[PDB]
Design a protein around this ligand. Structure first.
Ligand SMILES: CCCCCCCCCCCCCCCC(=O)O
Length: 133
């Protein structure tokens, strides 16, 4: 199952190409300016076989709870209503979001004790690095 090393609280320390990624999602300018300044905390928790990823920041809070391999309805930070799914691949915690015929991926993997989120949309790639805190 998900590695227990994911469990805990994570703080963003680096974000690369997040603006171009938000644009690819269709997020407008005012929202992107605040999104580019956000340094969110991400809390990953587990109750039985339901995993919860909770994102907290001054600008926006989000939370998804899910079971691996089971589609679920998601409301994203930019208020997209998506059909999403989280699965594992070589220990990486990979999320797909589908809506209005579009599709974006958020792959969260542990690299030397840090959590690295790789976000992809229409060939645009964003990388966000978190420290465990
Ligand atoms: C982080 C504040 C949200 C700002 C709202 C603008 C649109 C962003 C929507 C998608 C956010 C992607 C973040 C997931 C990757 C991560 O956990 O670092």
């Amino acid at each position: 199952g998900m590695s227990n090393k994911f469990l805990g609280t994570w703080k963003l320390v680096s974000s690369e190409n997040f603006d171009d990624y938000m644009q690819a999602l269709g997020v407008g300018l005012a929202t992107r300016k605040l999104g580019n300044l956000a340094k969110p905390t991400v809390i990953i928790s587990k109750k039985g076989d339901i995993i919860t990823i909770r994102t907290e920041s001054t600008f926006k809070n989000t939370e998804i709870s899910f079971k691996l391999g089971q589609e679920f309805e998601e409301t994203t930070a930019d208020n997209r209503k998506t059909k999403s799914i989280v699965t594992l691949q070589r220990g990486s915690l990979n999320q797909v979001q589908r809506w209005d015929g579009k599709e974006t991926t958020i792959k969260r993997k542990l690299v030397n004790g840090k959590m690295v989120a790789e976000c992809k949309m229409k060939g645009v790639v964003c990388t966000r690095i978190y420290e465990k805190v």
